[PDB]
């Protein structure tokens, strides 16, 4: 009766973009010039970024798809043609070539192809020729279901030139996992300046079926996220590991017989446990995010093995406590039968592996020799304050964009996390310091796609405050904060760090100084005086049936609501339930049944201990 | 009105015994004298098993407290005088000794000391001594909180004689654990004919840091039931492990220099896990039972680490899947950098070292040099069905009894789980076959301690029908056939393997051959006829509260109640649950707001699928 929240967000604060089930994935965000690019079967879009809804489809398109001989190749004698034989975009990333224009990658029906393409979703001239597209190593998956990764990088390489960084897996049938860098080109001379650079081929010390979630540049490396069969729990069991990698910008290979080959390429365990003598490890990282104006903090989810009991968890890492692992101790096993141990630093050649310079071939053959049969750090790398941001069971935990908040006259800093699930919706995380500890709570649930639609891709846009939301079926533009629609009660209102209570006009508004807020429930009983006491009447004999909100809010459905009486002639007291008199509703409600004259009076539901909403109720004699 | 069960059973069906916070532990049971032995602090009761609430706390107790200078030393070694400096009985054991006798050992003051007595809780005159009795010290622990085990052998040990096996601690402070046994005497001559037995002190390989759940005697050998730090994990992380450990009751040991330890020491890993390609283990065993009458099965509980999220299995275990680790592959870590790799059989002395001979001094000192380097085998014993036979998240499950009814057509069988848990409340689980494939179905939860009150020993009588649980405040007697008090409902009673419902009463009573009962579920509609029905009226369209249960039992809120709504002008439609007309009552009751006419009409209540009760619904 009191509080109603209206659902969200499948049903204006929500905006739809559909031109058919076109399997929309990859994103990339262009605020500058109000564009969201998003990858499909065959095509590429450039959607108006403040409101996607206002793209259109045949205009704001094009259309990339393969050659008949590539269908031909593809099906083969038998492959399926309705999806798997069609050029799925996996990589967009801005690349300047006489401008800003966009590097696309494809696969192309199992011929990863890629192009360069004008922002304004335009080929470049028949007679105009990018050195390098088109040649060399695949460049994105060969199968749309391939986890792979992509970053484009124009500073830090070998002679100042260009290159993709890239993680893919190619065809399954083969088992080429790479971690690769493209030929160095000058894309004014058209001149190769340098070959391309990967991961020694076949070797499962540096790749074993790996899964990419991310990867980014960063200072003078290029770091790569994955997990991967973990080589050294085998003689313990089987187990999927996550791995940060890293490879030097600079990195030129070795001598002329592995000069193809990273002189620079290291990997460590990432850490995500709940702190204790027996640690308890969330193994398997989903995704990873990095706020674009921060390069030393990175946020990823991660699951147990999805085979028992199941639980995901929220990490994130200093770029600090990464380099560390890459800057301590190396792990080692002797021999195929011996156990993995730290290396001794005195073992360990000069320069040190892993390090920078200009001209690897230069470094001492014994520094070669020691990286590449010491890829993997003994460090796992460090998860900030040693436990998760958050952990929930019988989740999956999927992709996730973080925001930043600053209260700066209250001295309060929020990160909010929005996090996707297997089911289709999004968890609204709040973290906040209390006392020198991390927090964290459950601010909101919302829907953001059916459950049988898994979410694709997810991102976040400071300068619109929206959440972008990729589908087999559409994309969803979601405003982070809906103060005004959502929370109509001061209870919701002030748990949400983008909301602010008005006691004056009764209503949830975004934040600003004066209003009532406890995200870290510190101040409980802010809202006491916002609850307003509605007053009911009611015939004797006849069923009445109180209830603060139409549909409990999913976060609070699994809290205890207690309900209390005042009558004259009464003490206050609390409402046992007994069969024909007081009944519950799953939604926190009260229902008299029976109602006689001493029924009437002060009602107040609480919700664990906090006063939620008060009913004045009056019987007559009927 | 409604169905109502009432609640059980902290509270004729359950009877108590208690003389006040005693610290009730080990159970002994002798039905054929209608005895149920009790350790306790300082204590020792014999309860009337058929009754335990007939026994008397000042008769039926013999005292059993340390000396006044037992409980100064164990102060002097700082530990706590009014609950660590007593005599906690630890093991009680039927032996034969000029009669049916009592072996009992007590921590008494962390000083172990050890006692015979009559069946009668009587000590034996003092003019009497019954050799080697004494000293506990490697029999019993020296700590309350220890987990440890032991029973008392008479037969198939050296030269004929009696022998006690135990796993405990052997020092209160330093670290000691051990699996041993006691010097060979023959009880008649008094002589000291064998020595003891025990695995080598401080060997980490043997045991590290164990937690002793269990122990029996079975064929020709002693098998112990424990969990401890997995050593050959320690280069992936730190773990703990369940084991199973056999000895040979042959044992005499080997030459001069290490007779005195085990020459036929085995031990292997026991698997508890969620079968797929990335198996899930529940490594941690609790405890483990087995059936009186049945030496070929052991049924015991698993919980992953503590720390974490938790979850719990029950496994069971079939003998020849435990001899099969044993004769199978040994494991071995070559050096102490190396990974832990399977024995080629090629490289195994003979004869096979863990089998039983009468003169193990005899054996080929490379057969000794081998079994101590290699004590544990390398196969994880096989838990039947490769799955739990049942499993459950954010429950901890501890002790547990098994029950087996036999069914006379076709030579079938249930068996009954009856698990405790940390809470206090102890889940009925019946397992059942069906085309060759084992299922297993929670038919009830009730409560036989409060939350605060862990409980400590469980033991069922097949006699009595009968399970006793032990806490620190008392023991509670309770029957595990409940059919009438329990299940007013058909709905209920016909899931339960011991009950039956009977139409012609209207009731649930043991079972007997007509009454129906559906343990496995394969005749859904069997209650259809006895479900609760009756009809309602709403006034002027005022709120309608419909619902079968008065309070949904435990184990079928986990299931979907869904109404339906049979209408002459809507025809039979699932109530769709909408927030402004239709919403839940945490006891499966369905609240129907703004009544009005076409809200006239049957409505079924089906709790997943299974008709429950029925409503006829005029409104007016
Ligand atoms: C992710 O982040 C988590 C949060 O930050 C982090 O949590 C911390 O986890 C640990 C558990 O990993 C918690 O517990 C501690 O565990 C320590 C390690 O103990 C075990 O490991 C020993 C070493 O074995 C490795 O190293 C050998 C030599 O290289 C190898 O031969 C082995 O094969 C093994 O290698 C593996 O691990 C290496 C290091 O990770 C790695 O290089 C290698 O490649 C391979 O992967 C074992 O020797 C030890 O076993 C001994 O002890 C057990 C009893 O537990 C016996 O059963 C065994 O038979 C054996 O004798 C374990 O298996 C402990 O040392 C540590 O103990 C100290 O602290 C506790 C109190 O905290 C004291 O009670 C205890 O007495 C110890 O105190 C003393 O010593 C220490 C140093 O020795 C000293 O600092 C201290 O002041 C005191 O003097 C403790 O139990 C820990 O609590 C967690 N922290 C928090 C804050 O919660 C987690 O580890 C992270 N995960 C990863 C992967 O990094
Ligand atoms: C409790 O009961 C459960 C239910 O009954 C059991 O479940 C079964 O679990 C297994 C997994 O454990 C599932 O199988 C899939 O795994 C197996 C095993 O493969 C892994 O192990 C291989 C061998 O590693 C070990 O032996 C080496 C040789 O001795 C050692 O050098 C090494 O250090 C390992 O040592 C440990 O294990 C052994 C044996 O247990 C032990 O003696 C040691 O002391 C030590 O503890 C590895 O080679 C594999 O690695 C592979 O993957 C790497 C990438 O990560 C590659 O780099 C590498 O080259 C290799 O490819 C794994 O780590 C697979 O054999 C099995 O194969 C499927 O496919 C083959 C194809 O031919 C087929 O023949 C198989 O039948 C199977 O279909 C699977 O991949 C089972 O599915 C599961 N069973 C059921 C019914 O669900 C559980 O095992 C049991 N637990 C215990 C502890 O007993
Ligand atoms: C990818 O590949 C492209 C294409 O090759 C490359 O771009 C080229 O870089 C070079 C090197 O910087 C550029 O060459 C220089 O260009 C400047 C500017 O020239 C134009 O503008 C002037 C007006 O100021 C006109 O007069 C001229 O005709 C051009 O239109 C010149 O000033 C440079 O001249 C010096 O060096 C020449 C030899 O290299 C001499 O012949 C000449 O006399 C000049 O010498 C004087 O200055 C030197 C220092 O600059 C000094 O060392 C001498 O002693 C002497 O005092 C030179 O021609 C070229 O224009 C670029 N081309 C394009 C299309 O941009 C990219 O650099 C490459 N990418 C990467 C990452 O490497
Ligand atoms: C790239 O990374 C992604 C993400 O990490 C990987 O995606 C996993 O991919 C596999 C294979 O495609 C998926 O597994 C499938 O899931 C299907 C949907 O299953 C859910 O829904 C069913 C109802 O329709 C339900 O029955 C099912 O239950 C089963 O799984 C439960 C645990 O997941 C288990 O408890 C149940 O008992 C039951 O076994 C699921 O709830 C299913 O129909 C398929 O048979 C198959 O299982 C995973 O869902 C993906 N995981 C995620 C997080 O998206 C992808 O594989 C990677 N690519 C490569 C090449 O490796
Ligand atoms: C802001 O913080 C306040 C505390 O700092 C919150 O108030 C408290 O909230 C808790 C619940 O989180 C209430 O809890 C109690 O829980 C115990 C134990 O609970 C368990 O056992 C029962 C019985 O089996 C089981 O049913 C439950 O599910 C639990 O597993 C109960 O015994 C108590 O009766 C009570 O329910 C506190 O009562 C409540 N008040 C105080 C003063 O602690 C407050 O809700 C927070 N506000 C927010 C988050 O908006
Ligand atoms: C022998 O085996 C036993 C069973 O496996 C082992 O038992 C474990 O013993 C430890 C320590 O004695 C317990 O840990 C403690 O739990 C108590 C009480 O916990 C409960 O109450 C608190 C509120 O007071 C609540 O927060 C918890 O959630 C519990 O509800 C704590 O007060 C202690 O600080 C400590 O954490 C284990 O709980 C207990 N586990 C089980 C399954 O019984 C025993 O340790 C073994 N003996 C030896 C010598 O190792
Ligand atoms: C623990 O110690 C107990 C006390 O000694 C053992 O019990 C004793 O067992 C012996 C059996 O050897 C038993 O003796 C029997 O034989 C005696 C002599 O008999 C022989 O002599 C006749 C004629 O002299 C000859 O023809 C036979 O071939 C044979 O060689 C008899 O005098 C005696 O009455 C009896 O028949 C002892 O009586 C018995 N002692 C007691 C107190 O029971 C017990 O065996 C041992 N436990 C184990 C497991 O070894
Ligand atoms: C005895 O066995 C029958 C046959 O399985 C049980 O009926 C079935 O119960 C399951 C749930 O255990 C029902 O499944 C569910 O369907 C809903 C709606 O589609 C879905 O949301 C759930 O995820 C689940 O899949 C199933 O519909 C139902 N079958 C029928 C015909 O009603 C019955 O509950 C068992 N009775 C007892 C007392 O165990
Ligand atoms: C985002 O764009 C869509 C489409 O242009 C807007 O939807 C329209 O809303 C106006 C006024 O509310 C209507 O007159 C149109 O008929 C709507 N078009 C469609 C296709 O529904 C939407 O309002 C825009 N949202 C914002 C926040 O600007
Ligand atoms: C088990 O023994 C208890 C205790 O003797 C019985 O409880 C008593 O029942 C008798 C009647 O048989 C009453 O006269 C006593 O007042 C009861 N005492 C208590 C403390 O309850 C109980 O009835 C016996 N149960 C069975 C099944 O024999
Ligand atoms: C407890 O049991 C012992 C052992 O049977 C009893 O002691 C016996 O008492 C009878 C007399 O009734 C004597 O003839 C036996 O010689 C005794 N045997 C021993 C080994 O002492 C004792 O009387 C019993 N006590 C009670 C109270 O029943
Ligand atoms: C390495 O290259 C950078 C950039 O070209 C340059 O500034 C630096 O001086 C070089 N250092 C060496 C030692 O060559
Ligand atoms: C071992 O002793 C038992 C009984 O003591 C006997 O039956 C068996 O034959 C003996 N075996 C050998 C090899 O002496």
Redesign the pocket.
Known sequence: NLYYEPPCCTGEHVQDFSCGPLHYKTFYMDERNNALYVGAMDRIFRLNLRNISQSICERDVLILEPTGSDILNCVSKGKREKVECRNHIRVIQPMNFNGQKLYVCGTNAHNPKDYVINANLTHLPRSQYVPGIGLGIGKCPYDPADNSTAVYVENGNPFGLPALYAGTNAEFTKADSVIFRSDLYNLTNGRKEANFKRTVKYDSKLLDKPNFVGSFEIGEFVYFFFREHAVEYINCGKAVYSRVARVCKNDRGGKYMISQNWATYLKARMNCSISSEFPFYFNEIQSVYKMPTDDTKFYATFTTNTNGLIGSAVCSYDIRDINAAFDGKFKEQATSNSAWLPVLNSKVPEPRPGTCHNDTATLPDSVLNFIRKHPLMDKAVDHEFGNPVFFKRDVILTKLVVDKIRIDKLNQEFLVYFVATTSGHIYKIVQFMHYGQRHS?LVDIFEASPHSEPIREMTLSHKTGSLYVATDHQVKQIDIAMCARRYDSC?RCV?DPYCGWDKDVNACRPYQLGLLQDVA?ET?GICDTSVLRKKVTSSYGQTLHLSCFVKMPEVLRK??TRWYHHSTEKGRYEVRYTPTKYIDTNEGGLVLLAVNEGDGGRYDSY????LLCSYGVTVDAH
């Open positions: 709570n209870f748990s429930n409980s809290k205890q919700l664990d201990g906090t």
